Each structure stands twice: as structure tokens, then as C-alpha cells.
Design a protein around this nucleic acid. Structure first.
Ligand SMILES: [Mg+2]
Ligand SMILES: [Mg+2]
Ligand SMILES: [Mg+2]
Ligand SMILES: [Mg+2]
Ligand SMILES: [Mg+2]
Ligand SMILES: [Mg+2]
Ligand SMILES: [Mg+2]
Ligand SMILES: [Mg+2]
Ligand SMILES: [Mg+2]
Ligand SMILES: [Mg+2]
Ligand SMILES: [Mg+2]
Ligand SMILES: [Mg+2]
Ligand SMILES: [Mg+2]
Ligand SMILES: [Mg+2]
Ligand SMILES: [Mg+2]
Ligand SMILES: [Zn+2]
Lengths: 95, 211, 64, 125, 43, 25
RNA sequence: GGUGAAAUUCUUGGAUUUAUGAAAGACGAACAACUGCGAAAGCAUUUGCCAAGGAUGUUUUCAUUAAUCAAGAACGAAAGUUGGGGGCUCGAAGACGAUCAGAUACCGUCCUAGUCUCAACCAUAAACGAUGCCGACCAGGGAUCGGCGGAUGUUGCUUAUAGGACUCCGCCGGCACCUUAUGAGAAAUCAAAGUCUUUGGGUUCCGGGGGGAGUAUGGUCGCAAGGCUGAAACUUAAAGGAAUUGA
RNA sequence: CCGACUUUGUGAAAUGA
């Protein structure tokens, strides 16, 4: 019983994909099988933006954003609810 | 415990807009642990935004060396530059390409250093192609062009004027108007200047760049 | 010397807790009426209650 | 007058380090664990609150009034996300009365790192 | 110093001190360690 | 991995049979 | 430091933390894709040299020189074996700390061979598209990679055009992808797994219930682990595939 | 192996008196 056309990963034209480390557990999963999100998160949340912009020394300053690109494996993704088991039909769309 | 530490006045060379970058502190001069030459090489990391009182340049962290101290006032000469971490990550996104280069340059006062330059390709407006990639040969042509341009830009009289070029992004705005015939190259910069081997002391030479 | 501050429960954001025991609310400071800080309260609370708040810094976060 | 607040805010602890503009001298250094009894509450956000207010008091005891934050995760080949204490300590160090100079995330990201701990199949707990 | 015995054996520690008088300093002189060299110590 | 470790059992028992045969050689 | 929590551990011989410099050796983030190259294995920093290669273009040449292939031959990940070099990180073995009824494991600390380079072997992987290779026809579409041809309309380029970047159209050749049966099939599913009881284009390898068993033996390659070739007795009525309802 | 005295002169700073 085959569950996915691409196998769960998107490798076509290759035979080998260099692997990466899960950010949670450090399981080794190939780069193009790993649930990759690029999250860009403010240093603070919106209860802590004015209390730092009324304490920034120089007026007109803008907060940075944590740009980082986290990698996860399938186990840590399912466990963290980054992704969910979708129905047989709904499983097929990519948006 | 902190009653034996006295502050000093950190001030930057005269090629900068504003000076008096900050205050540091040393243990007062004993013998053997004399304070003056005891440290001698504090490397400070002052952003170019509050050395030129601007905010378009909240990137470009300029890194300064202390090279000699003068009576409760420590002199300083330029040492390097780099992006603040946050800038460069915001510069790199999917569906484009990143181009980088590096080159040793030796300037007229015998200063060896390294230039790391970076660029990214544009989307020309009306583009419906979802990506803007080069073809890995245009990449190498423009990397060669970047190295050639930067060598020709540099090899000039000193770091004095060489930072008079670093400040207004001379290398940047003069890269594309030489290499856009191959790609647009938006957000060309010089991500880093790493001073490799500082030559000597030259009391006399410090004191015109810094006053 | 932390002096207790009073705040008014402007709107109840939810009823959190593992067992469903803690209300999770927004308190608006009476003393300086621009400080909206979000806290966990125990027991029945409805809108507008003046609330005795020993420590100010400790706040909840959405679905704490 | 400025300092540099090397906030090493990882999991498992949060370290607040205040140094002069050149990094060669520690003005004051309180951890989240110095202020709690529990080896598990040494990483709670509250530890960062009181450990930050203690730094603020010691800095006003001494002369600096504004402070360049340098937020930092563990870095290296570990998580790049600053731990629970980062935002909390920043809130405390802002609201306790002090001025914050320029915010920046300086957590070491390698160009590419050595083997990371755990083995192939990772921490399977 | 290793001599003799109804079996062949050294009979005492084969690592001798640096100052041991000539004629006693036979064996492994002033050895910091012994056994097969593994790991960093084999650098 | 029942099949794998079965394979490994037979592998061990087969080195053991070769060990016995070079005795009886 | 570490975890849900702890300790072994390091620590007033100043650990962790901060900055500066050095050294060593590994890895080449982000850009990085339903993307490229390769016979498969596999291949990501720069520049140079070396030789090779598909595709495209061609009013060049030769003219059947071709397809697939028992014997035979090359390459063949990781692990492994022998011997120099290196000894960063990680780490089978091993030792400890916890957990537990026990815990030879999961968790954590130290750590050997190993991980990297070279010389020499080994010859297997879920070596996967679980789909041999060559060829023909059959359905639709937009993407995208490479080359090429045709179109104006602008460039932060260009002594002006050309070119290069972008847009439109079309041919090949790739990896794919999306809808649909008029098809197939045990079905999942497949536009190639289709053009099969209305059965034949060519070619190689291979299976005949489940075990026993990839085992015994014999041979043969290998230093060794191993590899290649490989039964029978006897046992058994099911083993298995796809999908459906439930639990 | 180690300390002191000795061959063993010249002058400079830092801590102790
Ligand atoms: Mg291919
Ligand atoms: Mg493979
Ligand atoms: Mg004897
Ligand atoms: Mg005995
Ligand atoms: Mg220290
Ligand atoms: Mg490519
Ligand atoms: Mg790279
Ligand atoms: Mg096989
Ligand atoms: Mg097979
Ligand atoms: Mg095959
Ligand atoms: Mg095309
Ligand atoms: Mg095409
Ligand atoms: Mg059979
Ligand atoms: Mg099966
Ligand atoms: Mg079934
Ligand atoms: Zn994981």
C-alpha cells in the first residue's frame, strides 16, 4: 500500500540528498524530506513593544526580527503540531 | 571592588561625523599592570548609525581598535566592518540567488585586508517567472567583475579615504553601474572588511586621522 | 518594597488551566490608565472587577 | 552612559552580563539560577525578571543608564531560538527604569557545524 | 634487575624513576603512561 | 527487525560451524 | 552543565559567562527548489589547469556500422579489514549516573575503534520509481531546466544597435506535475503499470503455496567478516495482496 | 634532584621594610 506519490519527500532526478539535523531531537533526515519553516519572530510580543520603544535611547528606532530557518523531522513536526495528519483526499493538496 | 577602576574617553578618528564614541574603564596604573599599555588594544564595536547620526545605516557595525592612549583619553583607528546580524538575514530570501566574493587588498600604507562583497538578483517589473536565478556562468562572470572592480576601487592612498568610500557605499553603487549588463544585482554591499595584518604603530600617522 | 497595585478586569480572554480552573484576563491599571497587562486570576470574575495585584511583572501569555 | 547587556538567554538558565563598551570587563553578572532554589525554575521567565531588575539596580549603583542589548541563544550547533527568559528579561530591563540602546541577536550560527550530539536517530525520549 | 626466578617475569614495576642510579635505570624510563596508545594520547 | 536479527543469528551460528569444522579438520 | 526531574561532571587551584589572539581538524548553513549534473553509487565555498559529456544548431561526413546481451570486464554508499598521516566534533565497545520489578536499553556524563586523507582490499543496501533496455502509436494543460528560432518595449547596462535582464509565441530534449476515462487492473492506483482470451515488435534476467533456507554441503573469489553458486529430509493448509464495516 | 654561601661585576623599575 503506497501512501504518497513522491514518497513523502520531493526527490526527483537525484539518488542522494544531503541530510540535516532536526532542531528538536537531532534525528538525521534528508534536506528535502524535512519539514522546513522559515519563521521570522519579533524579539517581543505585542504586550512588550511600547514598553521597549519608550525605553529605546534614540527616537525612531525599529525592533529587529529573529530571522532563523528551523528544520524539523516528521516525528518532531507531528509531535509539535507543526503539521497534522490530513484526510485521504485533503492530504493531496499543497497550498 | 569597582572603586579602583577609572573610566576613559573613547573617541573615534576624524573621518567620522560624530566622535566621542563612548567610555571604557581600566584598573588604575600600578607597576607591572600599568594601565596605559596594560590593555592598549581594546576592540570596540560601534555602529555606524551613531557615528554618523543617521538611521539608514543602522547596519554596518564599524569595529575600532585602540592604538594608543593620551591622558585620560584613548585614541582609536579603524579596524573592520560587518553587517549587523539582522540585516543580512533579511537580505536573503528564497526564489533568488546570493552572490559573494572576497579579495585581499594591500593599501598604500602597508595595510593588508580582505573585502567580502555580496549581491542579489532583481526581479525586473512585469516578471511573471516566479524565481530570479542566474545560470551559474553569469554568476562567475559577475563574481570576477566584483573582484576586479573592488581591486581597482581600492589600492589607494589609505584607510582614511578608503573609509570615505565605505561610508557612502561607493563600492556598492559603483558595482551595479558596471555589472547590470548581466544582472540587475539589487542590494549590492560590501558585507565585511577584515583587516588581516596591521603594519606598525606610527604615532605620527595616527594623529592626522585622529584629533 | 513592592506596593500592591489595583487593576480592572476589562475583558475576560478565556478560561484556561489544565482542569479548567483559571480564568485568563486583561487588567488595566487604575494608577496609570495606559498599562494593559494580561494575567491569570482564580475564582469567579466578571468584567470591571478591581483586582489586587501583588506583583506587576508576572504576566500570562495567550493560552498560558 | 552605555553598557553592553550580553543576555545569554538559552534554555535551562538565563545569564545577564553587563560589560563596558569593549567587552574586556564585567560590570555585573547575575544568572537566573542565582535567584531561585529550583534547578527547573532556574529557567522560568520569572528568574529573568528578578535577575534583570538586580542588574538594573547594580548598574544605577555604578553609573551606566543605557544599555546595548545583545540577545543570544546557545548558538553553535544547538538551538538558535533564544530561550524562555529572553523576552522576559528584556521586559524587566526595560520597565525597571533604564534606557535600551540597540537590540541585536548575536547567537553564533556556523557556516556549517561539526557533528551535533545525539547520534543518527536523535534524542528519542 | 629483571633477572632470575623460577618463572620469567619482571617481578616489580617496570617503570623506573628519572633519578634512579645508573644500573638501576633500566626498563621504561620516567614513563608518563604505558599500554597501547589510544585516542588523543596517540597524537 | 525480526528478519534482520534472524539473519544475524544465523550468521553467528555459521561462524560457529566453521570454527567447529576447522577443529575437526 | 543536564533534564519532566536529578546526579555522575566542572567549580573560589576562579567553572559557566565577556572580549582579543593563536593552533588543529572536520563541515561547507542561509541562497537550496516537487531544481541541475551523473551509468548507478553519488555530486554544493573560490579560482586555475586537465581531460571528458548530454542537449541544441547545422544544405558537414561515413552508410547499416544497429538492439539486448550466457562467458568476461569497469564503477559500486555506509559499515568493514591491513598500513602510514590526523585525532576538532560525534561515537558502536566499555565505564559510570538516573529510570525500572529488573534496564545489559530509551535519558545524561566520560569514551576506544571509528568518523577525515592516502595506499590496498571487500562487493553488499528499502543500491527504490520496490517499475530492466531499445522502439511505435495513443489526451489535455500550464509550469520549469538546457539550446535554438520568431516578435515590440524598457533598461539604473550599452560610443548607438546587437547582445545581457524581463514579456509573448513555437520547436526539440530533460525531471516532473495537475484533470479525465474512451483504457487497464484484484484494487490502491497508472497517461504510461495503456494499445492482452479481438492474446506475437525485439531482447535479457527471473518466480511456481508457506516454511526449512539463502541453511547443509561441494565449488570458487576474499587476509577476515564475508560474497557468488546452492539443495534435500521433514513440517504445513494456509502464508500473503488490495480494499470495506467495526473495534 | 634541591637550597644557601662562592666565582659574582654593572643599573632599572615594581612591591616590602
Ligand atoms: Mg537525469
Ligand atoms: Mg539512494
Ligand atoms: Mg627475574
Ligand atoms: Mg606473581
Ligand atoms: Mg573566567
Ligand atoms: Mg543549479
Ligand atoms: Mg554556501
Ligand atoms: Mg541484492
Ligand atoms: Mg530490487
Ligand atoms: Mg533496477
Ligand atoms: Mg524554456
Ligand atoms: Mg520544454
Ligand atoms: Mg516456493
Ligand atoms: Mg510483503
Ligand atoms: Mg491488508
Ligand atoms: Zn526531531
Amino acid at each position: 500500500t503506497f501512501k504518497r506519490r513522491n514518497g513523502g519527500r520531493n526527490k526527483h532526478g537525484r539518488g542522494h540528498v544531503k541530510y540535516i539535523r532536526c532542531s528538536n531531537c537531532a534525528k538525521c533526515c534528508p534536506k528535502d524530506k524535512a519539514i522546513k519553516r522559515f519563521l521570522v519572530r519579533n524579539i517581543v510580543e505585542q504586550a512588550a513593544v511600547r514598553d521597549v520603544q519608550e525605553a529605546c535611547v534614540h527616537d525612531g528606532y525599529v525592533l529587529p526580527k529573529l530571522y532563523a530557518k528551523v528544520h524539523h523531522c516528521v516525528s518532531c513536526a507531528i509531535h509539535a503540531h507543526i503539521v497534522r495528519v490530513r484526510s485521504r483526499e485533503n492530504r493531496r493538496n499543497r497550498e | 571592588p569597582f572603586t579602583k577602576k577609572q573610566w576613559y574617553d573613547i573617541k573615534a578618528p576624524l573621518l567620522f561625523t560624530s566622535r566621542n564614541v563612548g567610555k571604557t574603564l581600566v584598573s588604575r596604573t600600578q607597576g607591572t599592570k600599568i594601565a596605559s599599555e596594560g590593555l592598549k588594544h581594546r576592540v570596540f564595536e560601534v555602529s555606524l548609525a551613531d557615528l554618523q547620526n543617521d538611521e539608514d545605516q543602522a547596519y554596518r557595525k564599524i569595529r575600532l581598535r585602540a592604538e594608543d592612549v593620551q591622558g585620560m583619553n584613548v585614541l582609536t583607528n579603524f579596524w573592520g566592518m560587518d553587517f549587523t546580524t539582522d540585516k543580512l538575514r533579511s537580505l536573503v530570501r528564497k526564489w533568488q540567488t546570493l552572490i559573494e566574493a572576497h579579495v585581499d587588498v594591500k593599501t598604500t600604507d602597508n595595510y593588508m585586508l580582505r573585502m567580502f562583497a555580496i549581491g542579489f538578483t532583481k526581479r525586473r517589473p512585469n516578471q511573471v517567472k516566479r524565481t530570479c536565478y542566474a545560470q551559474a556562468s553569469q554568476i562567475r562572470q559577475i563574481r570576477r567583475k566584483m573582484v576586479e572592480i573592488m581591486v581597482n576601487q581600492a589600492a589607494s592612498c589609505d584607510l582614511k579615504e578608503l573609509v570615505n568610500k565605505f561610508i557612502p557605499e561607493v563600492i556598492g553603487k559603483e558595482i551595479e553601474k558596471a555589472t547590470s549588463s548581466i544582472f540587475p544585482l539589487q542590494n549590492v554591499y560590501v558585507r565585511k572588511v577584515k583587516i588581516l595584518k596591521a603594519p606598525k604603530f606610527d604615532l605620527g600617522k595616527l594623529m592626522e586621522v585622529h584629533g | 518594597d513592592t506596593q500592591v497595585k489595583l487593576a480592572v478586569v476589562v475583558k475576560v480572554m478565556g478560561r484556561t488551566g489544565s482542569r479548567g480552573q483559571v480564568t485568563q484576563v486583561r487588567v488595566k491599571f487604575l494608577d496609570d490608565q495606559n498599562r494593559l497587562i494580561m494575567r491569570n486570576v482564580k475564582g469567579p470574575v466578571r468584567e470591571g472587577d478591581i483586582l489586587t495585584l501583588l506583583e506587576s511583572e508576572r504576566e500570562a501569555r495567550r493560552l498560558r | 552612559v552605555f553598557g553592553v547587556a550580553h543576555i545569554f538567554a538559552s534554555f535551562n538558565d538565563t545569564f545577564i552580563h553587563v560589560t563596558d563598551l569593549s567587552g574586556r570587563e564585567t560590570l555585573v553578572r547575575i544568572t537566573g539560577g542565582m535567584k531561585v532554589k529550583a534547578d527547573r525554575d532556574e529557567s522560568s521567565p520569572y528568574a529573568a525578571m528578578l535577575a534583570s531588575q538586580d542588574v538594573a539596580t547594580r548598574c544605577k549603583e555604578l553609573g551606566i543608564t543605557a544599555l546595548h542589548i545583545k540577545l543570544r541563544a546557545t548558538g553553535g550547533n544547538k538551538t538558535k531560538t533564544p530561550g524562555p527568559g529572553a523576552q522576559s528579561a528584556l521586559r524587566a530591563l526595560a520597565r525597571s527604569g533604564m534606557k535600551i540602546g540597540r537590540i541585536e541577536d548575536v547567537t553564533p550560527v556556523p557556516t556549517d557545524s561539526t557533528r551535533r550530539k545525539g547520534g543518527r536517530r536523535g534524542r528519542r525520549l | 634487575p629483571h633477572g632470575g626466578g623460577n618463572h620469567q617475569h619482571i617481578g616489580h614495576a617496570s617503570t623506573v624513576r628519572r633519578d634512579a642510579p645508573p644500573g638501576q635505570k633500566v626498563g621504561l624510563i620516567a614513563a608518563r603512561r604505558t599500554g597501547r596508545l589510544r585516542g588523543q594520547a596517540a597524537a | 527487525m525480526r528478519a534482520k536479527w534472524k539473519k544475524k543469528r544465523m550468521r553467528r551460528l555459521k561462524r560457529k560451524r566453521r570454527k567447529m569444522r576447522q577443529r575437526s579438520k
